[PDB]
Write a protein that binds this ligand. Structure first.
Ligand code: ADP
Lengths: 270, 193, 627
């Protein structure tokens, strides 16, 4: 088990694999297509006959099996997903062995339910699953973000790099150290960068407090979901309460009791 | 190091245009011949000619541009030195052209760096000349301050340790505004196409 | 002064030896019922009342009211380690604690909060006022009434933040109760002691806490302000499990404890020993316009049936509105149509607005501002403004820094908030020049487009409009016509449903009638004597709400004749060449009034005589100058 968890990657892996195999499009073939096959090998055909990646799911498929995985994916989604990625990459080889097995796919779940709407929220739903909606406000520009740097030297060309864990980096007296020929040389260009961007959002279904302005929220972005949508649309969100402190002052390093909240990016609904 | 391949490649590019470049004729020395008197430090080059004779240095040039970029100034220097009594005053301005691909603001991500892609727009709220003593001379204060170094970096940094002595590395020598490197640019914004 | 030991035993005895027998069937333990209720994990905050502590003891019946900060924490650790009564994995915090010990520097019981206590004084003690909190209200749990203003939304506060070195697996406890703090260094442990085996510990909210943390602004009543002063305000920090216990426009009654505040920072402006205080509370019993005084938190049928069949009339509900004069009968009933409305549907995807918007024209003395100022009071969620009483941004949204977040959000004006109701305006002509477009926009309902930032400025205003303005020099000069004597945008005049002009020429025997009418407003404080029983406002409030929920159909058997009614409508005004405009939207209007009128029937039985009043209503709405 991982530290603050009570689960295992392999059990979820196996049960999701069996679920996708025990699948006849049952979410609308059992519940509600001339296909008595999994939609998922059908979809890997659709993904590989195209070689157009980027799947998506809906969490109503996963009612047919145990309701436990719904629960233990609501509670710990930030820790459980990539096991489903390796299940997908097993299904890759099951569909075709010499396929393009180096380009990786997302997973885009959705649809537990509307909470009530964005006005009426609590603390305890702090790292779990939500889906609300309203209207879009802006369309702003994208930002790089570091994960590793380039470095140098003068004698023998110590041309090196070292990456980020999340916020903690190392350096000996050299880069690629042997015998300490100099001190550490920093450049920061010849490097890897990731896309992200902020876009504000409204509440305007009729889920409105009478005589009240919409209390508005905000969303980050990640690489192949950045400006995924043009403004002036009603779109639903799929994401996780993801919090961060605030910096008291700035002249000092003290920090404020008010942790902020914002939602990460999983999937949207045009 | 990466760009030694580009060194050899533009070396033999030089060595070919050292002879003819087009049908016993040359189109990329007579600009240098006019250059030879004032030494204004520009020679633009067709990218199509890279597709003619050097056989696809585009994917050699068009992704890792910025790291290859400065090596092409040294390439230019190795060209101009071959025939004129030459000092290292020679410099690299570039006005690249003859490139097929012409894209817009929207196809921009973190994976688009070190390229030569082509864009249009409109000109607004332009801004002036703004000089820059990009270079100078800087080391300890005992005697040994003659520093032709790389202090032209974007983020600028006084601190240099030494060349000859073992001395202070936080006490700087003063600056050079006399026998150094200065250059000229400007800055604007541009709107959607 | 007092002791922490026999006092502790006394409060434990109070916890246990307590079967306060207020009446029959009370032989068990009230606080022991509350105890086992904690044992259910159902209740998470006990409310306390002095009567219990009035009968038990007297110290702590007056000792805790001034401090409130120690005896509560003793109450905390008293009950926190009292387990008289499975399951472990039910609460997200507790299940994370049981994660963390099922995985396995002492943990406090402060970490396992898991239950709370507040208070409830006896006899809302009195309405102590925000001004009169003078130099003796530090620490004292005082009862006071205020007025709400500028509420923001729920935020999670933190109390204890734990790191872990990742080299010694340290689970540190760094509790915080103020606003600002700093975490600890890389290894404040003993396995990670001065010994080199040290990494750098890092925060995990999993085994940490958060708390409901709401904030609003609090403004004064504007009834007890000094004679030559200005309204003041105070700040709230309503903690615990009372977040979302107020709304903008609730005359609330809040009961808590005044406390001081240290806005730590620059030691010169701040650090002057000046005490920029703030408030704390636990209980929000809003005694005006809240869940308590307003029921249904109107649809409750049985309690009203006794009066429902008790009376059967409509005009009885008619002149009960502003009943201090006589006259203008046909205006009040149709105005009452404005309060109810109730015609909502989604036919063919297109939504139809059911909010009547009418104006008042001609004012050589009519009591124009009286109906507005009255109905804005009786009509729940109303407003009132005038021509130069507010700019365009005063009517529309605006911007201001946010004490909750600082997001610089948008806050709206009068019309921005009066939706689902009626926003009243008076003296419309001299409002502003560009304002006419601002009111031209509400005729395409739920559409408040602004150019403040000028990006979208989208907003859903579903308000009615109660317009009222004056004629210029003169009142229908013998040659003048509409749009000549009035200098309002005729396009704006087009977008109304009922136009209403009030002209009073000399009536040699009506003047004495009103003179005896209004003079009796002053010798006493009630007009209608011994001729009918005008209804209380409070019963009015529910009687109007019950009519709304019907949403009848339309009678096709009269649809054949409603069009003929529109025929005579558009013809008897068309018989002359240059009478005032008669519009094609009339057929879209007559349908919208007969429905709300049937709403007070609550029957879905719109009849042939139902519109028989509407026909004369619009009939007299124009041709107001014939005699
Ligand atoms: N018959 C009446 N009954 C009661 N009040 C009246 C009557 N006639 C006149 N008044 C008085 O006339 C005043 C009219 O003011 P109003 O017309 O509202 O100002 P404005 O013309 O600026 O709107 C009212 O405040 C009311 O006190």
């Amino acid at each position: 088990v991982v530290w603050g968890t009570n689960v295992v990657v392999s059990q979820c892996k196996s049960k999701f694999k069996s679920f996708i195999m025990r699948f006849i499009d049952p979410s609308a073939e059992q519940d509600e297509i001339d296909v008595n096959q999994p939609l998922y090998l059908q979809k890997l055909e659709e993904i590989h006959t195209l070689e157009e990646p980027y799947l998506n799911l809906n969490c109503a498929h996963l009612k047919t099996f145990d309701q436990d995985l719904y629960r233990q994916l609501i509670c710990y989604p930030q820790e459980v997903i990539p096991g489903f990625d390796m299940a997908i990459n097993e299904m890759f080889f099951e569909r075709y062995p010499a396929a393009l097995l180096e380009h990786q796919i997302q997973v885009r779940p959705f649809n537990a339910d509307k909470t009530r709407n964005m006005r009426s929220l609590n603390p305890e739903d702090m790292d779990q699953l939500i889906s609300i909606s309203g209207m879009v406000i802006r369309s702003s520009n994208v930002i790089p973000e570091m994960r590793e740097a380039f470095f140098s030297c003068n004698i023998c060309s110590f041309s090196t790099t070292v990456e980020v864990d999340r916020g903690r980096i190392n350096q000996p007296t050299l880069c690629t150290n042997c015998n300490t020929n100099h001190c550490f040389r920093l450049i920061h260009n010849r490097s890897e960068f990731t896309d992200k961007q902020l876009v504000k959002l409204q509440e305007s279904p009729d889920d409105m407090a009478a005589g009240q302005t919409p209390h508005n929220v905000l969303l980050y972005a990640h690489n192949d979901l950045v400006d995924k949508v043009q403004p002036g649309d009603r779109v639903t969100v799929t994401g996780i309460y993801r919090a961060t402190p605030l910096k008291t002052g700035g002249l000092s390093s003290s920090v404020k009791s008010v942790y902020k909240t914002h939602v990460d990016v999983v999937h949207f609904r045009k | 190091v990466k760009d030694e391949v580009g060194i050899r490649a533009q070396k033999l590019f030089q060595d070919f245009l050292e002879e003819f470049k087009e049908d016993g004729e040359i189109k990329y020395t007579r600009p240098a011949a006019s250059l030879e008197s004032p030494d204004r430090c520009t020679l633009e080059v067709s990218f199509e000619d890279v597709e003619k004779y050097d056989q696809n240095l585009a994917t050699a040039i068009i992704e890792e541009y910025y790291h290859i970029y400065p090596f092409l100034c040294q390439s230019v220097s190795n060209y101009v030195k071959d025939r004129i009594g030459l000092k290292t005053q020679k410099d690299c301005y570039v006005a690249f052209t003859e490139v097929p691909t012409r894209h817009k603001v929207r196809d921009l991500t973190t994976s688009k760096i070190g390229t030569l892609i082509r864009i249009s727009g409109q000109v607004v709220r332009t801004h002036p000349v703004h000089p820059e003593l990009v270079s100078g001379v800087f080391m300890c204060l005992d005697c040994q301050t003659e520093i032709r170094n790389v202090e032209q970096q974007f983020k600028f940094t006084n601190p240099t340790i030494c060349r000859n002595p073992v001395c202070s590395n936080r006490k700087r020598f003063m600056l050079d505004v006399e026998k150094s490197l200065f250059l000229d640019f400007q800055k604007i914004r541009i709107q959607e196409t | 002064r007092r002791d922490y030991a026999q006092d502790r035993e006394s409060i434990k005895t109070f916890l246990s030896e307590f079967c306060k027998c207020d009446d029959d069937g009370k032989k068990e333990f009230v606080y022991g019922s509350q105890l086992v209720k904690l044992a259910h994990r159902e209740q998470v905050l006990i409310t306390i009342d002095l009567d219990d502590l009035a009968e038990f003891n007297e110290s702590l019946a007056e000792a805790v009211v001034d401090n409130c900060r120690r005896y509560t924490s003793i109450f905390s650790d008293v009950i926190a380690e009292l387990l008289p009564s499975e399951v472990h994995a039910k609460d997200a915090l507790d299940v994370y604690i049981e994660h963390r010990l099922m995985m396995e520097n002492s943990f406090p019981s402060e970490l396992m909060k898991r239950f709370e206590v507040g208070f409830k004084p006896l006899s809302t003690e009195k309405a102590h006022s925000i001004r009169e909190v003078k130099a003796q209200h530090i620490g004292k749990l005082v009862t006071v009434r205020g007025i709400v203003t500028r509420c923001t939304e729920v935020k999670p506060m933190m109390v204890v933040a734990t790191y872990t070195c990742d080299r010694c697996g340290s689970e540190t406890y760094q509790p915080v109760n103020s606003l600002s703090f700093t975490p600890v260094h890389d290894c404040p442990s003993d396995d990670c002691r001065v010994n080199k085996a040290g990494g750098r510990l890092y925060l995990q909210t999993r085994g940490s806490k958060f708390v409901k943390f709401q904030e609003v602004k609090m403004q004064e009543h504007s009834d007890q302000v000094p004679v030559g002063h200005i309204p003041r305000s105070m700040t709230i920090m309503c903690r615990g499990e009372v977040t979302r216990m107020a709304q903008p426009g609730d005359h609330i009654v809040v009961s808590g404890v005044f406390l001081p505040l240290m806005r730590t920072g620059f030691a010169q402006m701040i650090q002057g020993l000046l005490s920029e205080t703030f408030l704390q509370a636990h209980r929000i019993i809003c005694i005006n316009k809240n869940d308590e005084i307003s029921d249904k938190d109107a649809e409750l049928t049985p309690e009203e049936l006794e009066e429902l069949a008790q009376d059967d009339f409509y005009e009885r509900l008619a002149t009960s509105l502003a009943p201090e004069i006589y006259g203008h009968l046909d205006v009040k009933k149709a105005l009452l149509l404005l309060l109810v409305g109730g015609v909502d549907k989604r036919p063919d995807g297109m939504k139809i607005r059911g909010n009547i918007n009418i104006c008042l024209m001609g004012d050589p003395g009519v009591a124009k501002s009286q109906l507005l100022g009255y109905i804005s009071r009786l009509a729940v969620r109303s407003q009132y403004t005038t021509g130069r009483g507010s700019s365009g941004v005063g009517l529309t949204a605006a911007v201001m820094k946010d004490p909750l977040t600082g997001e610089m959000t948008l806050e709206g004006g009068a019309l921005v908030l009066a939706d689902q109701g009626v926003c009243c305006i008076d003296e419309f002509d001299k409002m502003a020049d560009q304002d006419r477009t601002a009111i031209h926009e509400v005729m395409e309902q739920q559409t408040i487009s602004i150019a403040k930032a000028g990006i979208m400025t989208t907003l859903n205003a579903r308000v009615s409009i109660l317009a009222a303005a004056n004629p210029a020099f003169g009142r229908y000069n013998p040659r003048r016509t509409v749009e000549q004597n009035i200098q309002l945008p005729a396009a704006l005049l087009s977008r109304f449903d009922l136009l209403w002009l009030i002209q009073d020429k000399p009536d040699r025997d009506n003047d004495l009638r009103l003179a005896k009418h209004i003079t009796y407003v002053h010798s006493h404080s009630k007009q209608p004597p011994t001729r009918v029983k005008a209804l209380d406002m409070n019963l009015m409030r529910r009687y109007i709400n019950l009519c709304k929920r019907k949403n009848p159909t339309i009678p096709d058997e009269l649809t054949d004749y409603i069009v003929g009614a529109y025929v005579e409508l558009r013809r008897e005004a068309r018989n002359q060449k240059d009478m005032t405009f008669t519009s094609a939207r009339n057929l879209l209007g007559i349908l919208r009034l007969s429905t709300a009128l049937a709403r007070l029937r609550l029957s879905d039985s719109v009849e042939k005589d139902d519109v028989a009043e509407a026909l004369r209503l619009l009939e007299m709405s124009k041709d107001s100058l014939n005699q």
